[PDB]
Design an enzyme around this catalytic site. Structure first.
Site, PDB file in Angstrom:
ATOM      1  N   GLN A  15       7.693   7.297 -10.532  1.00  0.00           N
ATOM      2  CA  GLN A  15       7.180   8.479  -9.855  1.00  0.00           C
ATOM      3  C   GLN A  15       7.864   8.774  -8.537  1.00  0.00           C
ATOM      4  OE1 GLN A  15       4.165  10.941 -10.478  1.00  0.00           O
ATOM      5  NE2 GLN A  15       5.837  10.779 -12.044  1.00  0.00           N
TER       6      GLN A  15
ATOM      7  N   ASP B 170       0.824  -1.206   0.000  1.00  0.00           N
ATOM      8  CA  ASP B 170       0.000   0.000   0.000  1.00  0.00           C
ATOM      9  C   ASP B 170       0.858   1.256   0.000  1.00  0.00           C
ATOM     10  OD1 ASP B 170      -2.628  -1.056  -0.057  1.00  0.00           O
ATOM     11  OD2 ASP B 170      -2.887  -0.834   2.119  1.00  0.00           O
TER      12      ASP B 170
ATOM     13  N   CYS C  16      -1.517   0.676 -14.156  1.00  0.00           N
ATOM     14  CA  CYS C  16      -1.711   0.762 -12.711  1.00  0.00           C
ATOM     15  C   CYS C  16      -2.828   1.786 -12.505  1.00  0.00           C
ATOM     16  CB  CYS C  16      -0.393   1.070 -11.985  1.00  0.00           C
ATOM     17  SG  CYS C  16       0.568   2.441 -12.712  1.00  0.00           S
ATOM     18  N   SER C  17      -2.719   2.750 -11.589  1.00  0.00           N
ATOM     19  CA  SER C  17      -3.789   3.754 -11.590  1.00  0.00           C
ATOM     20  C   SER C  17      -3.556   4.840 -12.627  1.00  0.00           C
ATOM     21  CB  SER C  17      -4.007   4.398 -10.218  1.00  0.00           C
ATOM     22  OG  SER C  17      -5.232   5.154 -10.223  1.00  0.00           O
ATOM     23  N   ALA C  18      -2.394   5.508 -12.602  1.00  0.00           N
ATOM     24  CA  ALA C  18      -2.108   6.500 -13.641  1.00  0.00           C
ATOM     25  C   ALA C  18      -1.343   5.955 -14.837  1.00  0.00           C
ATOM     26  CB  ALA C  18      -1.316   7.665 -13.066  1.00  0.00           C
ATOM     27  N   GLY C  19      -0.789   4.752 -14.756  1.00  0.00           N
ATOM     28  CA  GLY C  19      -0.050   4.233 -15.880  1.00  0.00           C
ATOM     29  C   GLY C  19       1.366   4.763 -16.025  1.00  0.00           C
ATOM     30  N   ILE C  20       2.001   5.206 -14.918  1.00  0.00           N
ATOM     31  CA  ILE C  20       3.341   5.803 -14.987  1.00  0.00           C
ATOM     32  C   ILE C  20       4.269   5.286 -13.900  1.00  0.00           C
ATOM     33  CG2 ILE C  20       2.646   7.826 -16.346  1.00  0.00           C
ATOM     34  CD1 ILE C  20       2.885   9.496 -13.784  1.00  0.00           C
ATOM     35  N   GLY C  21       3.753   4.980 -12.705  1.00  0.00           N
ATOM     36  CA  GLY C  21       4.621   4.666 -11.556  1.00  0.00           C
ATOM     37  C   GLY C  21       4.964   3.196 -11.484  1.00  0.00           C
ATOM     38  N   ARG C  22       4.050   2.388 -10.925  1.00  0.00           N
ATOM     39  CA  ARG C  22       4.248   0.946 -10.966  1.00  0.00           C
ATOM     40  C   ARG C  22       4.391   0.453 -12.401  1.00  0.00           C
ATOM     41  NH1 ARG C  22      -0.383  -0.749  -6.657  1.00  0.00           N
ATOM     42  NH2 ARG C  22       0.291   0.695  -4.986  1.00  0.00           N
ATOM     43  N   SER C  23       3.606   1.012 -13.328  1.00  0.00           N
ATOM     44  CA  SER C  23       3.729   0.588 -14.723  1.00  0.00           C
ATOM     45  C   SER C  23       5.104   0.937 -15.285  1.00  0.00           C
ATOM     46  CB  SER C  23       2.662   1.296 -15.564  1.00  0.00           C
ATOM     47  OG  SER C  23       1.371   0.797 -15.275  1.00  0.00           O
TER      48      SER C  23
END
Ligand SMILES: [Cl-]
Ligand SMILES: [Cl-]
Ligand SMILES: [Cl-]
EC number: 3.1.3.48
Length: 283
Positions: A265, A184, A218-225
């Site tokens: 990110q 989390d 992921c949620s925004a498509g930049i961090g985990r992705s």
């Protein structure tokens, strides 16, 4: 040997405590290209985050007769010989567009790196069916989506979906690779589960050269992705290159950021990507 070399640099950055400085250098050096389409008034409700938009040059265009816009970018990593579509978690009004993109781009694998709700907040719409007998029909894009089976493991789940173009009655099997255990807060303490997940995606056949690019979100498509794409691209390069120790993770990330803003990110995500590459280099 390329793992031990990179590991000694990693320990140097840890001892210097320079992760935040390296990360800010990347942010400063990153490409800036226009995102005029994403910012048109008619696209306001197609973006989950006003601060995360696809560049015009690399955005995925929908083909049906309406509005061609989806918050998704084609990242073409030419030397690694792989392309990826990085996209935000679909919104309640863009799940039809998401599956239209999967159909039109010929993708056979979707990599999801978040839970639909995390810390009690929604990160993504429920864009696939949870029950076999309750299939989803996307009336705007004329697609039907059925859950055929799923393989639920302790750290990730792989779902077998059937996507049908209702106009033509053609069907395709889409594999949904859902990493369900990213923490989390922060990044995983160890990259072992992340690397085992990546191995299952890469061995599935969904990313064969005959198929379109994997869709990662992921949620925004930049961090985990971004972390998934960066680690996967670097490990592929360690095979393409004559000398695997020549792979420079910062340079690879800057190359990816030519195609979508904001990839990675946080400094912790950057450190984790290095850690995942170091470990995967051993195997
Ligand atoms: Cl407009
Ligand atoms: Cl490089
Ligand atoms: Cl950024």
């Amino acid at each position: 040997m390329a793992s031990m070399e990179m590991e000694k640099e990693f320990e140097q950055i840890d001892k210097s405590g320079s992760w935040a400085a390296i990360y800010q250098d990347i942010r400063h050096e990153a490409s800036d290209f226009p995102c005029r389409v994403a910012k048109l008034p008619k696209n306001k409700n197609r973006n989950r985050y006003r601060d995360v938009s696809p560049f015009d040059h690399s955005r995925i265009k929908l083909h049906q007769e309406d509005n061609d816009y989806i918050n998704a970018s084609l990242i073409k990593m030419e030397e690694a010989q792989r392309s990826y579509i990085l996209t935000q978690g679909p919104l309640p009004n863009t799940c039809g567009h998401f599956w239209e993109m999967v159909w039109e781009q010929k993708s056979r694998g979707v990599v999801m790196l978040n839970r639909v709700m995390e810390k009690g907040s929604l990160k993504c719409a429920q864009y696939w069916p949870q029950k076999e007998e309750k299939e989803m029909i996307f009336e705007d894009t004329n697609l039907k989506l059925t859950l055929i089976s799923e393989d639920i493991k302790s750290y990730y789940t792989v779902r077998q979906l059937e996507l049908e173009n209702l106009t033509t009655q053609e069907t395709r099997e889409i594999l949904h690779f859902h990493y369900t255990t990213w923490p989390d807060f922060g990044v995983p303490e160890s990259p072992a589960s992340f690397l085992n997940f990546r191995f299952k995606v890469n061995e599935s056949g969904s990313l064969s050269p005959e198929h379109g690019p994997v869709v990662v979100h992921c949620s925004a498509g930049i961090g985990r992705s971004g972390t998934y794409c960066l680690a996967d691209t670097c490990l592929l390069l360690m095979d393409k290159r004559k000398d695997p120790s020549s792979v420079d993770i910062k340079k690879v990330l800057l190359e990816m950021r030519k195609f979508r803003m904001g990839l990675i990110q946080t400094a912790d995500q950057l450190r984790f990507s290095y850690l995942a590459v170091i470990e995967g280099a051993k195997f």
